[PDB]
Amino acid sequence: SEHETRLVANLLENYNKVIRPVEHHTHFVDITVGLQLIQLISVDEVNQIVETNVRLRQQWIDVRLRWNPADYGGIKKIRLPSDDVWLPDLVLYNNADGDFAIVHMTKLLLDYTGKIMWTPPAIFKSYCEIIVTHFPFDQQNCTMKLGIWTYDGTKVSISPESDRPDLSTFMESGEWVMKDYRGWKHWVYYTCCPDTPYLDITYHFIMQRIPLYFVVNVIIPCLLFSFLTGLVFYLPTDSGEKMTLSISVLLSLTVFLLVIVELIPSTSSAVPLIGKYMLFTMIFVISSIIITVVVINTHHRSPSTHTMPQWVRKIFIDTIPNVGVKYIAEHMKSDEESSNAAEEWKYVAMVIDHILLCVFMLICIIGTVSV
């Protein structure tokens, strides 16, 4: 268009984009800043980095970029490259892996009154100190801090477009649920520049994790192997195999704890409850293995070399349960006595196994009352 070509030639003829859009240098540029979250691309918990797709809406008045539409065929709005005009230097303070400022530099909208709306896209890879306590039933609060970074509040003051970031076009994450989101404006005095305040806007998102994936992949096998731990108490010592699946379950729990460790960041701020549960389960399995060894040793006690003490016999057999030719005959009598003593030891071992089984089922049903 001839009119728009002439208008753009006239507007930028003596325009210096180094200088702020103020009539007088004592004035400040008022910039309305808004954030539009398009997609939560990823949340790397181990590296503690949240990367999102955003649009950074910025509106401000440039008094040097106004015209009369009557002189230009009625044109009231044009599109200009962002590199041709003065732009705010918004910087993502908590940048972890990427760019501090906008790098795409898309075109902006300019109307005849000098108002400029600029909505550049960005991939914000910001630092989020993730809280690992209630993993994986945990909510994470992560923020983006945006500021002018070179002009104080008396030069390029900014204000939030609305109290909340815009999520009207937000793609559902599937892995996280946006419980809440809000933006707050702050005046900060830094160590660099304590005399004057610098303005920033912090947008925080509180997002709840959907635990189905981690539940299915981690929690269910751990519960299965815990139920497998109590079974060793009901497994008779006479079949062997007690140590076999006892150690098998212990190794499985160790492997799943290793997986959980690989899932979470190495930070020591807090101990995950899933990790505490796995550690306590491993300690319970270790204690069960120790008692299993004791029971096997008691079951295989030699009737001759080892004699049963009186107190253990009394309690474990009374309280808890209620809760040439002359040579062969002598040999058979001695063998009968030895067999009776061996049976006494085996009965004591069986009664320890049943007590431990009753203890484990209590643990289980109390955990059920806990649900």
Ligand X SMILES: CCCCCCCC/C=C\CCCCCCCC(=O)O[C@@H](COC(=O)CCCCCCCCCCCCCCC)COP(=O)([O-])OCC[N+](C)(C)C
- In the bound complex, what is the minimum distance in angstroms from residue 318's beta carbon to ligand X? 34
Which of ligand X, another protein, none does 273 bind, CB closer than 5 to 8 A by kind?
Answer: none
Quote the CA–CA distance of 133 and 146 in Å, as a whole number: 28
Q: Which of residues 216 and 315 has its CB atom nearest to ligand X in the complex?
A: 216
Closest CA to 59 of 29, 16, 28: 29
Q: Which of residues 221 and 303 has its CB atom nearest to ligand X in the complex?
A: 221
Nearest to ligand X by Cβ — which residue? 216
Q: Residue 114 region, left (φ>0) first, then alpha (ψ -120 to 50), else beta?
A: left
Other C-beta atoms within 10 Å of 205: how many? 23
Which of another protein, ligand X, none does 105 bind, CB closer than 5 to 8 A by kind?
Answer: none
Which of ligand X, another protein, none does 326 bind, CB closer than 5 to 8 A by kind?
Answer: another protein
Q: Which of residues 69 and 221 has its CB atom nearest to ligand X in the complex?
A: 221
3-state helix, strand, coil in the chain (%, to 5): 40, 25, 35
Q: Which of residues 204 and 346 has its CB atom nearest to another protein in the complex?
A: 346
- In the bound complex, what is the minimum distance in angstroms from residue 231's beta carbon to ligand X? 13
Which of ligand X, another protein, none does 178 bind, CB closer than 5 to 8 A by kind?
Answer: none
- CA-CA distances (angstroms) from residue 174 to 177, 252, 256? 7, 30, 24
Query: How many chain residues are in contact with ligand X, going by CB under 6 A?
Result: 2
Which of ligand X, another protein, none does 81 bind, CB closer than 5 to 8 A by kind?
Answer: another protein
Q: Within its chain, how far is the Cα of 227 from the centroid?
A: 28
Per DSSP, which regions of 24-138 are E strands?
31-44, 49-61, 77-80, 91-92, 108-111, 115-118, 121-127
- In the bound complex, what is the minimum distance in angstroms from residue 218's beta carbon to ligand X? 13
Quote the CA–CA distance of 30 and 203 in Å, as a whole number: 19
Which member of 63, 177, 216, 315 binds ligand X (CB under 6 A)?
Answer: 216
- In the bound complex, what is the minimum distance in angstroms from residue 134's beta carbon to ligand X? 20
Q: Which of residues 137 and 284 has its CB atom nearest to ligand X in the complex?
A: 137
* Pairing assessment for the beta strands 158-160 and 31-44 based on DSSP bridges: parallel
Q: Which of residues 184 and 213 has its CB atom nearest to ligand X in the complex?
A: 213
Quote the CA–CA distance of 303 and 320 in Å, as a whole number: 22
- In the bound complex, what is the minimum distance in angstroms from residue 216's beta carbon to ligand X? 6
φ, ψ of residue 32 to 5 degrees: the values are: -85, 125
Which of ligand X, another protein, none does 24 bind, CB closer than 5 to 8 A by kind?
Answer: another protein
Contact 101, 118 (CB under 8 A): no
- In the bound complex, what is the minimum distance in angstroms from residue 105's beta carbon to ligand X? 45
Subset of residues 239 to 298 that bind ligand X, contact rule: CB under 6 A: none
Residues that bind ligand X in the complex, under the rule CB under 6 A:
212, 216
